[PDB]
Structure 1
Amino acid sequence: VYSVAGAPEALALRAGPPASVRAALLAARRRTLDLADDFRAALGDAYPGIGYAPELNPPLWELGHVAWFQEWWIGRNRQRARGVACEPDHAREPSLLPQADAWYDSGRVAHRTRWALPLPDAEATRDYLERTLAQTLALLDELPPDAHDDALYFFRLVALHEAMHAEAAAYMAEGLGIALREGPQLAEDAELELPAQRLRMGSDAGTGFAFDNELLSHDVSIEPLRIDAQAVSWARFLPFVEAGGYEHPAWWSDAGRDWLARQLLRHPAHLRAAGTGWQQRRGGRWLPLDPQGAAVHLNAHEAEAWCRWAGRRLPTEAEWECAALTLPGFAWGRVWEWTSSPFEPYPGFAPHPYRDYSAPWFGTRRVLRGACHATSAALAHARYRNFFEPHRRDIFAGFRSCRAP
């Protein structure tokens, strides 16, 4: 369980016995409910509760969706023990909630529709979470200590899914100005030498859970490189803004210039000018910017444009994964980091039972690697592939740079 690829929670969730997965499910639910109570403390109980935006979902919808997904792949799943060989579309038991599928299945309930749904109230939503988890843990307790990877697959999957939605709660709270009880400085900007080598990129078979987009592992050639030891700080990033870099379209790509054309505010989000200085928004509060913090809420175009101005580039996801795994002193986990790699399948990819996790998003999404401060330690992993459209700035995204010698 001790590795440089992730914290012990991450390896215990992916490969550990039922006791470890049980611990992960309880910890995930504790986090989910604490975030839910922090949203409730700001918003109260009205539904939908929040104004509309494409990158938000109504708080009670997120809670129900977390329960719905767990119940879909555990309690209602008639082929749990088959793991990745489960037939996605087999007929399942009915949910505790008759309208659950019509409300919480995201591939069926169009986004704008969610704001008008007659969802269960705040307390009935928590009852649904409670009962589904009680059922989940009871089925988990039937597994023996040496339970096979196939027997534990969906218990690991639903735990990781809830972790992803907790992080979404954290960055949606930033958008909404909601302060959280669970809620950033970097150390020295430095350069590290990555020598030429071979990397066996992706997840192997002996280890337990892998996301489908991590398969199959394959060899990749890594060229000699000098790579930042940490994400780009504000002190490093902001001279680009000060040199009028946002008013100089030569620094930007085709899609970057397009995106920059529509931009009302020509600097990173959640920043604002204050005299000759800067303020940054955090927990709905504006505070003087810390230059030694990581630059955050930048999109792929902003990261690439800084790189062109600086004469550097983004790493490929292979270069990133190699450095994270082989270079002590390469520090990650403060912000997700845009790479230069589009989200594409590895050689031998095959979609897993939750078929819509990766495959619909190839090509239109850019890979980010690492983790941010709001990523659960049970999820954060040097082989994990995050994927968002290159324009997104609501997520906790930044970057690091590199250049060949």
Structure 2
Amino acid sequence: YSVAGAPEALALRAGPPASVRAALLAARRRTLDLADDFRAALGDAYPGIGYAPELNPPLWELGHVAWFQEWWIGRNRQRARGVACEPDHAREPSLLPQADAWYDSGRVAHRTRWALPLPDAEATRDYLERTLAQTLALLDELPPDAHDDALYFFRLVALHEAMHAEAAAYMAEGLGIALRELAEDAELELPAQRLRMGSDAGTGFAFDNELLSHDVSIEPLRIDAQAVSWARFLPFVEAGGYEHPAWWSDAGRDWLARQLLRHPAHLRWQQRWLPLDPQGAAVHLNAHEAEAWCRWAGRRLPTEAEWECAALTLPGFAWGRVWEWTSSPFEPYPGFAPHPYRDYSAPWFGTRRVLRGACHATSAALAHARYRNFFEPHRRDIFAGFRSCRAP
């Protein structure tokens, strides 16, 4: 097995306090550069955007990032216990008396986020600054041989902020907001083998959905060396794919039937409205579109096990351009237990499909071969594509 990600991903998960500190500062730099992109387009208007289930107001997102960090660091009286932390212990107050009523994604109703008396952009940035100052002061108290338990929440809040930064990028793309921030095709042989799937104990930070690590049998297959390109995808559209329900699942057909334009999201070929690059990774495809292309090509999506095995064993397996739909429903591994942020994984089993890899907007500190992403299979706003495989 190769390393699961770039140095930053390994350091945030396994490295000492100095490593988590650098990660928190990089995450905040990125949060604020994206906040400036939104500021340029919306001028700090709140809510600044119309309502959609796939959005949150930009100033709500910023406050949520600070709230989350403050909730799990400064206000957390059991930081040292890591995953043994009692999530519902009595906490110190927030810097903002109403923060818990505004920013708690577990408490605040979705449409309500457009109608809160939130602080302005300046005061929201002030809350971010003061909370980060508090977090770094507490981090600086930990010794260089600090245990995984001691670092657990520092690592969690850095990863959480990386995830909200990516969400800013895909929501920006949805809102037509501009931000400042493939090779030759090939097929790879994946031989029959046993995969030790998920995150092993004492490998540093794991998301709860990566556990338990467990051996699984991988069947021999041939897998795309990279994500499906527009060049490889569009011949399905040109061959009448979005007119031929027979290529689709029942859920796919139901979805397809309800679509005005019988072609991919952000296309007209022109994307966004610039002309389309065939060498680009097909993106803003949902699981239904990926699966239909696979039936038409006589290919299939990998399981997340097959994807993880390929990513860790095959040097020519190139990922990180688009999130990649797998055939795997988001379900607990054997021995799954929810970690202190209980609602991260457990409410979303069944209704979500696993995507693996990462996209151009994923932080280098998050992108990881063991990471399970999870969205409802109709979602196209996300930076999602896919790679295909077949039996030998």
Shared fold by TM > 0.5?
yes
1:78, 1:18 → 2: CA distance?
19
1:232, 1:189 → 2: CA distance?
9
How far 1:60 sits from its partner (Å)? 0.1
1:4, 1:287 → 2: CA distance?
37
Matched, 1:235 2:258: no
SS in structure 2 of the partner of residue 67 of structure 1? helix
How far 1:4 sits from its partner (Å)? 3.1
How far 1:5 sits from its partner (Å)? 1.2
Dislocated runs of 4+, deviation >3 Å: none
Identity %: 100
Does the aligned pair in 1 maintain the 2:2–2:312 contact within 8 Å? Answer: no
Matched, 1:388 2:385: no
The superposition leaves residues 76-117 of structure 1 with CA deviations (integer Å, 9 ceiling, x where unpaired) of 001000000000101100000000000001111111111111
SS in structure 2 of the partner of residue 369 of structure 1? strand
The superposition leaves residues 58-89 of structure 1 with CA deviations (integer Å, 9 ceiling, x where unpaired) of 00000000000000000000100000000010
Structure 2 equivalent of residue 113 of structure 1: 112
How far 1:47 sits from its partner (Å)? 0.8
The superposition leaves residues 128-182 of structure 1 with CA deviations (integer Å, 9 ceiling, x where unpaired) of 0000000000000000010011000000000000000000000000001111111
Matched, 1:318 2:318: no
2:189, 2:144 → 1: CA distance?
43
SS in structure 2 of the partner of residue 226 of structure 1? strand
1:383, 1:46 → 2: CA distance?
39
Matched, 1:295 2:282: yes
1:305, 1:256 → 2: CA distance?
8
1:31, 1:251 → 2: CA distance?
41
Distance 1:128-1:166 versus aligned 2 partners, 3 A rule: same
2:246 counterpart (241, 244, 250): 250
Does the aligned pair in 1 maintain the 2:286–2:380 contact within 8 Å? Answer: yes
How many corresponding residue pairs?
A: 392
1:238, 1:332 → 2: CA distance?
20
How far 1:396 sits from its partner (Å)? 0.2
2:314, 2:332 → 1: CA distance?
26
Larger CA deviation: 259-268 vs 162-171: 259-268
Does the aligned pair in 1 maintain the 2:294–2:388 contact within 8 Å? Answer: yes
SS in structure 2 of the partner of residue 78 of structure 1? coil
1:33, 1:52 → 2: CA distance?
23
SS in structure 1 of the partner of residue 270 of structure 2? strand
Structure 1 equivalent of residue 346 of structure 2: 359
How far 1:348 sits from its partner (Å)? 0.4
SS in structure 1 of the partner of residue 343 of structure 2? coil
2:68, 2:186 → 1: CA distance?
43
Larger CA deviation: 43-52 vs 29-38: 43-52
SS in structure 1 of the partner of residue 3 of structure 2? coil
2:281, 2:247 → 1: CA distance?
21
2:44, 2:223 → 1: CA distance?
48
How far 1:3 sits from its partner (Å)? 4.9
2:264, 2:62 → 1: CA distance?
30
1:46, 1:214 → 2: CA distance?
39
2:317, 2:170 → 1: CA distance?
25
SS in structure 2 of the partner of residue 356 of structure 1? helix
Does the aligned pair in 1 maintain the 2:321–2:360 contact within 8 Å? Answer: yes
For structure 1, the 5+ residue unaligned runs are: 273-277
How far 1:27 sits from its partner (Å)? 0.3
1:39, 1:135 → 2: CA distance?
26
SS in structure 2 of the partner of residue 287 of structure 1? coil
1:139, 1:201 → 2: CA distance?
34
1:279 counterpart (246, 270, 281): 270
Question: Over the residues paired in the alignment, what is the CA RMSD in angstroms?
Answer: 0.8
